[PDB]
Ligand binder design. Structure first.
Ligand SMILES: CCCCCCCCCCCCCCCCCC(=O)OC[C@H](COP(=O)([O-])OCC(O)COP(=O)([O-])OC[C@@H](COC(=O)CCCCCCCCCCCCCCCCC)OC(=O)CCCCCCCCCCCCCCCCC)OC(=O)CCCCCCCCCCCCCCCCC
Ligand SMILES: CCCCCCCCCCCCCCCCCC(=O)OC[C@H](COP(=O)([O-])OCC(O)COP(=O)([O-])OC[C@@H](COC(=O)CCCCCCCCCCCCCCCCC)OC(=O)CCCCCCCCCCCCCCCCC)OC(=O)CCCCCCCCCCCCCCCCC
Ligand SMILES: CCCCCCCCCCCCCCCCCC(=O)OC[C@H](COP(=O)(O)OCCN)OC(=O)CCCCCCCCCCCCCCCCC
Ligand SMILES: CCCCCCCCCCCCCCCCCC(=O)OC[C@H](COP(=O)(O)OCCN)OC(=O)CCCCCCCCCCCCCCCCC
Ligand SMILES: CCCCCCCCCCCCCCCCCC(=O)OC[C@H](COP(=O)(O)O)OC(=O)CCCCCCCCCCCCCCCCC
Ligand SMILES: CCCCCCCCCCCCCCCCCC(=O)OC[C@H](COP(=O)(O)O)OC(=O)CCCCCCCCCCCCCCCCC
Ligand code: HEC
Ligand code: HEC
Ligand SMILES: COc1c(O)c(C)c(C/C=C(\C)CC/C=C(\C)CC/C=C(/C)CC/C=C(\C)CC/C=C(\C)CCC=C(C)C)c(O)c1OC
Ligand SMILES: COc1c(O)c(C)c(C/C=C(\C)CC/C=C(\C)CC/C=C(/C)CC/C=C(\C)CC/C=C(\C)CCC=C(C)C)c(O)c1OC
Lengths: 431, 352, 125, 55, 352, 55
């Protein structure tokens, strides 16, 4: 449970955990899809794909190393996993690919074979992964004409028109030092890694900063992707949430836990202590749903997602759910808040502490990049337990009560009523 | 009644009661399935509802998984609430109500949904076919329930009596203080369980070879090969699996999935080729079989197969570890084949 | 009035030898004057079913009892419409007039009451 | 289907007066309702005709 | 273009156009099925409706059957209306419209119902499995359509082009004056048909042996054996079929059905054991295999197998007739086996 | 479902006045119907009150 981080030339961050069996090293950049443009959208996803290409991947495999990378909105990360002993051979492969081979990975035979893969990849996504496709579109309309609206995997149109020069252009503007953090998780010590790094000098484009832009903003709107040939209806709905490093980051995350997630087929799920289940189970209004409090640097999204085959009662699904959310402003109970506290701790635990160093790396790098440090799991619990009913009520009265929303859906959505109908349910009549 | 553990300064502990009751030991088709689904229902003192409402207020969940050999009752929770989940798991094993209405209202439905999900994924339709033809009645028993042969409430009770005993299970706690764990297991109802016999037979399963099965299916086509491994000859196959599923092998882009299922008395190697049209499936496999018949290895992935076999932190009780740094050559004797999908346009065992 | 409540009072009286000898004989006389047995019905057949508890109960009732309840109810309606009673040898005998649905009704009520209790549990820190 | 079922107006009449499923055992005490409708008509009809001559 | 016939003083004649287009010749799975179902739909000059309304007023009906080898277009009617049904059958072969809407509205549905009915009778699920494993792709082709591989309106048109030719069909009229029949066939559109090739290959199908398949099913259990016969060695198997299905054999009460399918280039012998519970099926078959391995015959049913093979008056064009009065001894070499139903409680090829 | 949907009386109101699916493009010419109901009410109300004083 130690968050160690020191700066010499490069800001090095590590979180050691003795019993681990393995160790992971890599760099995480403070720039992701939210830094691209509508036309070069998909560059970051492309980088990730070449970094994992058959050529580069075969080199580290001989050495007994494994590769992993993830593209997000605010950040990007390249990671190399290894045994606790080869904690040095990872640092060689890292520098070899980001300085020496930052021109060998971009050959006219590799880039074309990779481009052909992300194209079949992103296409496959839009053709079949409906729930994620919808959540991606939710960000698209909620933050339109603003950074957060750009899909992480990029659009098929900005992708097929992307050239090697664009990769370089992006890389030379974001893969800088002042916008980077070298992460090390697994078992290796902070002082073990920091030495192998402060050994090899060379700055490589120092003093350079990435370009700036215009702040992200929420806009009440919707995008309806009707498709009557699909067998279900997938919809996502949300209000403007909380950004990371916000006084209410936790109240919000707790508020989502109150309604939580559900799966109509799993017996135990049907028994949960969520009032909403009394309303939706009578006529079986949906196969599943899940609330969330997504947070980013400039903004966030608080809402839920759901999938259903009861295409003639979608208005009741949406109506009941939004009536429950009304309660957070006027009648949420102590026991509901308490049930949430326990469950939030359990999930926040399983995330920050799993048996996989790669997840730890991403989380560590991402956090240190936005707030210059990581909040310890124990420090979180103290904040979570401190939340009162009054807090939830004040938060909801600001974020949920009579506030614009964003909607997105695909499939048999004829039954999803108009905007103003849904919008009206964000409140209740009173004397 | 082996009680293992392993402490740590983390806040999330995870109790788990492994039991030798999987499909491999199933007396009737899918009975193990039904029982895994019958877990956490009603006990004689606590209802499934109270159990959930309580654990939620504490901060923990339950789950019951079904392997080909095991039936695991896991429980994830906050550290200091250890005894509760020990007695909870204890209660399930010793006194689940088994009410006739719980079968018709919760169990059967949950089970019907399980079979449905699997009936739509062709690779699993294949994996099930491999086991059925290699081990004709041991590990080749149907994993899930489908109603081909009757299974009453009583049959589910009998199988519970056999499987749930002190001599057939093993408590295992991750992120738990062994001192307290052993103390609580003995202080619970675990020790009251009528310790019967252990069905873990050491004699190697009588496997077959050169067998093949073809199943017509509407969806993606899949061709797969199944190879029975030895108790000691499994460490080489493991590197093979990681070799074919890596950047080192040239034909990694020609196969969907490849793995080695490790048991306590041998194992099974599986290779999967999946694609939309039958033509690409027939080619990619006809190439794999040919290139493997002219085997090669040299163990360049000796450090990759060892690294990938370590990322499994839940398996800190795995069999042989250093058997890898030995053999480094692979051939391809007799194996088993299964065609699923566009049958009239798929290879036969012969032309392979 | 719930069946849990009816049972509480009824059992208390049934156990105490003071009331048990005073009441039961009156109750037996009451049941015979009611006359439902002359129509081929068992008391449990008379319980009003239009509520969730009774619907759950009838759903859990085993097949053979269900087909029998059905025959008894239809037979009753037909006799009633003819303004007759069944021939005495067809009347339900006291040994037969068993509370066959009662155990299902009580189980459902407890399940229901528990849920009501759990949905409203307070918490003390 | 039969016209009495498909026509917008006739189906109302069909569901309330023609095909309405009644319990086989109801007795003459269940005949008072119709008698009440009849009374209502007799009151309205005789009343309107007298209203023509009333001040 | 062979035009056979046979007059009589009866009032009901029956024209019939046999064609070598069955499943055995099917280019794509079930295409023969679709075409048999597409017959009598719309032609370019007569609608399916007018055809029916007319024939009804005359007094006759049509029907199109599907064999493993043939596709027969039969027509039952009153004697003196012969030319009409000749031109009717002529019109179908030469110019059926094949409108995209007839496929979706009449053909596919009719076909879907056919597959459904057969998917519920286990003996047929078995018979289909026998053929598929003995003749791996000839007569082992799927008899009915099930959508595993695409089949467009065009694919149905191409197959029609191949199969419907003067060199691949044979007119046959029962209770018809051959003089007039030949006169009308030539006076019709039959002779205008672009006579292609005859797909009737004489080379014996390359059959396999010692093959087995197991299919899980919810219903009655069935165990069946399939035996490939020779072009001349089929006359003995015929008496065997009638022997096992008679009062002479003691084990006739232990088998459900037994028959010999006669083709133009060999044949297939089938034996069926069907019952509710798996135990009785396992026994009855384990007994048949054992008693047949210790073969016997003596041909006592030599006059019964000849009498039963004569009651077939529609088959007055059958192969060998006097081959029966020859061989009189049967053994049991290698064969094929299929388990359908309660699989986990059914015999394997081994223990037979 | 919502109470407005389940109640015997409210569902009538819901299907005719609340959830009734209307073609998105109808113009002000489609507003005359409601205006006709209003007229009918105004005629009945003012008529009954005058009937109280009329001979
Ligand atoms: C100053 C004060 C003045 C007082 C004013 C009086 C008030 C009048 C206002 C209302 C008058 C119209 C109401 C008529 C119906 C009311 C009766 C009723 O509902 O009884 C049902 C009741 C139920 O019968 P059920 O169980 O359904 O019938 C089985 C039948 O045998 C099944 O058999 P069925 O269908 O095959 O045939 C049935 C029967 C059907 O007969 C009927 O008409 C129907 C039932 C009427 C019974 C007589 C009521 C007396 C009214 C005077 O036909 C018969 O053969 C029976 C004949 C009975 C004699 C009627 C009197 C003739 C008088 C001539 C003058 O019939 C009775 O037994 C009547 C009980 C007496 C109640 C009187 C209380 C009211 C005060
Ligand atoms: C001695 C003889 C006396 C004669 C007595 C007169 C008879 C009176 C009895 C009935 C009076 C009540 C009836 C009112 C509705 C009748 C009008 C109608 O249906 O026109 C629909 C017609 C259809 O409009 P639309 O295609 O659905 O509208 C697109 C709007 O711009 C879409 O726009 P929007 O919804 O966003 O806003 C629409 C518009 C809506 O405005 C409205 O109020 C609705 C339409 C009324 C247009 C004016 C009619 C003139 C009546 C006098 O509001 C405006 O800003 C427009 C202002 C128009 C001036 C109204 C006069 C103010 C006079 C103050 C005194 O509206 C017109 O263009 C009117 C055409 C003139 C027809 C006159 C024939 C009647 C004789
Ligand atoms: C006063 C009646 C006015 C009759 C309407 C006149 C008319 O033109 O009716 C045409 C109608 C044909 O309509 P229809 O055949 O059903 O549909 C077309 C093809 N599918 O033909 C009909 O609607 C024929 C129906 C005749 C029955 C008329 C009255 C039956 C009396 C019961 C009324 C029930 C409704 C009560 C409403 C509440 C009143 C307080
Ligand atoms: C005059 C109204 C009289 C109201 C009836 C009084 C009453 O006791 O209503 C009880 C009723 C509860 O019934 P409910 O909850 O639906 O069912 C029980 C549980 N499932 O509660 C209700 O029915 C509440 C309904 C209140 C709405 C009353 C009037 C709405 C006005 C539109 C009338 C529509 C019908 C028009 C009929 C044709 C008229 C010409
Ligand atoms: C006002 C009440 C006075 C009604 C006058 C009764 C009419 C006499 C019935 C003559 C029968 C004729 C016949 O044979 O029909 C065959 C005809 C078909 O016969 P079938 O082919 O043998 O089935 O049957 C009918 O339609 C009979 C309809 C009788 C309708 C009478 C109304 C009864 C309801 C009373 C409630 C009214 C008040 C509510 C307001
Ligand atoms: C008689 C006609 C005169 C009607 C008088 C109009 C009443 C003024 C409306 C004031 C709006 C109040 C409000 O904010 O409601 C919010 C309330 C809910 O608002 P929300 O949460 O933002 O959706 O909306 C309503 O219910 C408005 C209902 C208006 C009903 C007026 C009737 C219009 C139909 C006309 C035809 C009548 C003749 C037929 C016979
Ligand atoms: C205008 C139509 C009209 C209707 C509709 C009507 N009535 Fe009347 N009613 C009258 C008139 C006119 C009188 C005065 C003449 C009379 O005394 O009968 C009257 C008188 C009465 C009387 C006095 C009887 C007496 O002793 O003279 C009663 C009581 C009565 N109505 C009851 C009813 C009932 C109950 C209804 C309806 C369910 C009804 N009315 C409907 C017009 C009507
Ligand atoms: C008793 C209820 C009553 C109803 C219902 C009623 N009216 Fe009248 N109406 C009267 C009375 C009373 C008068 C006489 C007083 C007057 O002249 O306005 C009258 C008079 C009239 C007149 C003469 C107006 C004038 O020049 O004085 C007309 C026209 C008329 N009504 C139309 C209607 C229409 C159209 C309706 C309904 C759609 C209607 N009425 C409904 C009672 C009613
Ligand atoms: C489920 O169980 C049922 C059941 O549902 C029903 C419906 C019935 C049958 C009974 C009924 C349907 C009774 C219904 C009665 C009514 C709908 C009455 C409605 C009343 C009215 C007063 C209508 C209004 C009349 C007028 C406006 C016109 C009268 C005036 C006129 C014609 C003036 C003419 C003027 C001139 C100058 C010629 C049962 O017997 C029954 O038993 C088991
Ligand atoms: C499919 O398309 C539609 C559509 O369907 C509808 C419904 C509307 C909306 C319009 C309407 C619903 C109009 C409906 C009108 C009526 C139902 C009127 C019914 C009429 C009556 C006269 C009711 C009768 C009233 C009474 C008996 C009482 C009055 C008397 C009283 C209160 C006396 C009180 C006495 C004392 C002493 C105090 C649309 O605009 C529309 O457009 C697209």
């Amino acid at each position: 449970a130690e968050v160690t981080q020191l700066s010499n030339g490069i800001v090095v961050a590590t979180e050691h955990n003795p019993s681990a069996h393995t160790a992971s090293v890599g760099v995480v950049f403070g720039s992701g899809a939210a830094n691209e443009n509508p036309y070069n959208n998909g560059v970051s996803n492309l980088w990730k794909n070449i970094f994992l290409s058959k050529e580069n991947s075969a080199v580290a495999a001989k050495e007994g190393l494994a590769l992993s990378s993830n593209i997000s909105r605010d950040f990007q990360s390249y990671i190399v996993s290894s045994l606790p002993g080869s904690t040095d051979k990872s640092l060689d492969f890292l520098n070899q690919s980001f300085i020496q081979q930052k021109a060998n990975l971009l050959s006219s035979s590799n880039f074309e074979a990779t481009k052909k893969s992300v194209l079949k990849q992103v296409q496959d996504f839009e053709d079949n992964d409906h729930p994620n496709r919808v959540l991606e579109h939710l960000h698209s309309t909620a933050f339109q004409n603003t950074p957060l609206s750009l899909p992480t995997r990029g659009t098929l149109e900005s992708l097929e028109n992307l050239v090697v020069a664009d990769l370089e252009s992006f890389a030379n503007n974001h893969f800088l030092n002042s916008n980077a953090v070298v992460v090390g998780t697994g078992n290796i010590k902070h002082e073990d890694l920091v030495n192998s790094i402060e050994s090899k000098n060379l700055s490589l484009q120092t003093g350079t900063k990435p370009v700036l832009k215009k702040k992200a903003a929420f806009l009440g709107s919707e995008v309806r992707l009707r498709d009557d040939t699909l067998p279900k209806a997938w919809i996502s709905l949300a209000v403007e949430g909380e950004p990371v490093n916000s006084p209410n980051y936790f109240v919000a995350k707790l508020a989502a836990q109150i309604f939580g997630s559900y799966n109509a087929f799993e017996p135990a799920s049907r028994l949960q202590g969520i009032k909403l289940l009394d309303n939706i189970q009578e006529y079986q209004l949906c196969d599943n749903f899940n609330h969330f409090s997504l947070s980013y640097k400039d903004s966030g999204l608080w809402g839920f997602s759901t999938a259903t085959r009861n295409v003639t009662m979608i208005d009741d699904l949406i109506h009941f759910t939004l009536k429950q959310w009304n309660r957070l402003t006027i009648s949420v109970t102590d026991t509901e808040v308490e049930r949430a506290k326990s469950l939030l701790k359990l999930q926040l635990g399983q995330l920050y502490e799993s048996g996989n160093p790669v997840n730890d790396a991403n989380l560590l790098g991402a956090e240190v990049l936005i707030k210059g440090s990581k909040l310890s799991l124990g420090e979180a619990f103290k904040k979570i337990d401190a939340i009162t009913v009054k807090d939830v009520k004040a938060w909801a009265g600001k974020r949920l009560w009579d506030q614009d929303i964003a909607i997105a859906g695909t499939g048999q959505i004829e039954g999803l009523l108009d905007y103003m109908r849904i919008r009206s349910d964000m409140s209740m009549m009173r004397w | 009644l082996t009680v293992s553990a392993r402490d740590a300064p983390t806040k999330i502990s995870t109790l788990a009661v492994k039991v030798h009751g999987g499909s491999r030991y199933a007396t009737k088709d899918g009975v193990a399935h039904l029982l895994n689904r019958f877990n956490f229902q009603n006990t004689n003192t606590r209802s499934a509802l109270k159990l959930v409402r309580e654990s939620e207020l504490l901060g923990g969940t339950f789950k019951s998984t079904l392997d080909r050999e095991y039936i695991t009752l896991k429980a994830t929770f906050l550290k200091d609430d250890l005894p509760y989940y020990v007695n909870a798991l204890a209660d399930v094993l010793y006194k689940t109500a088994f009410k006739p209405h719980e079968l018709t209202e919760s169990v059967l439905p949950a089970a019907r949904y399980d079979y449905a999900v699997a009936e739509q994924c062709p690779v699993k339709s294949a994996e099930d076919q491999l086991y059925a033809i290699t081990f004709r009645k041991g590990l080749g028993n149907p994993l899930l329930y489908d109603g081909v042969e009757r299974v009453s409430l009583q049959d589910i009770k009998d199988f519970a009596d056999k499987v749930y005993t002190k001599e057939n299970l093993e408590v295992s706690g991750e992120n738990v203080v062994e001192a307290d764990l052993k103390r609580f297991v003995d202080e619970s109802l675990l020790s009251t369980l009528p310790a019967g016999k252990s069905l873990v037979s050491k004699s190697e399963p009588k496997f077959f070879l050169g067998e093949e099965n073809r199943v017509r299916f509407i969806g993606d086509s899949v061709a797969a090969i199944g190879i029975p491994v030895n108790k000691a000859s499994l460490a080489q196959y493991e590197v093979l699996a990681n070799y074919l599923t890596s950047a080192l092998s040239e034909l990694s882009g020609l196969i969907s999935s490849a793995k080695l299922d490790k048991f306590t008395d041998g194992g099974l190697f599986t290779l999967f080729v999946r694609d939309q049209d039958s033509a690409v499936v027939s080619s990619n496999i006809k190439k794999i079989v040919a290139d493997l018949k002219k085997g090669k290895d040299l163990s360049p992935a000796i450090n990759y197969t060892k690294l990938k076999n370590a990322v499994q932190n839940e398996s800190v009780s795995s069999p042989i570890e250093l058997n890898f740094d030995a053999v480094k050559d692979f051939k391809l004797g007799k194996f088993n084949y299964v065609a699923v999908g566009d049958v009239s346009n798929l290879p036969y065992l012969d032309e392979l | 009035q719930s069946f849990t409540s009816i049972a509480r009072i009824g059992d208390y009286i049934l156990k105490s030898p003071v009331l048990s000898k005073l009441c039961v004989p009156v109750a037996n006389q009451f049941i015979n004057l009611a006359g439902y047995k002359k129509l081929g019905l068992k008391f449990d057949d008379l319980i009003a079913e239009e509520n969730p508890i009774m619907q759950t109960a009838l759903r859990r009732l085993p097949e053979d009892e269900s087909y029998a309840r059905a025959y008894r109810i239809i037979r009753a309606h037909q006799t009633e419409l003819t303004h007759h009673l069944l021939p005495r040898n067809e009347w339900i005998k006291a040994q037969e007039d068993v509370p066959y649905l009662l155990p299902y009704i009580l189980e459902a009520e407890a399940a229901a009451k528990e849920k009501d209790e759990l949905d409203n549990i307070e918490v003390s820190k | 289907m039969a016209f009495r079922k498909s026509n917008v107006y006739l189906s109302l009449v069909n569901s309330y007066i023609i095909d309405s499923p009644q319990p086989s055992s109801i007795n003459y005490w269940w005949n008072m309702g119709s008698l009440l409708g009849l009374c209502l008509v007799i009151q309205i009809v005789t009343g309107i005709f007298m209203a023509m001559h009333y001040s």
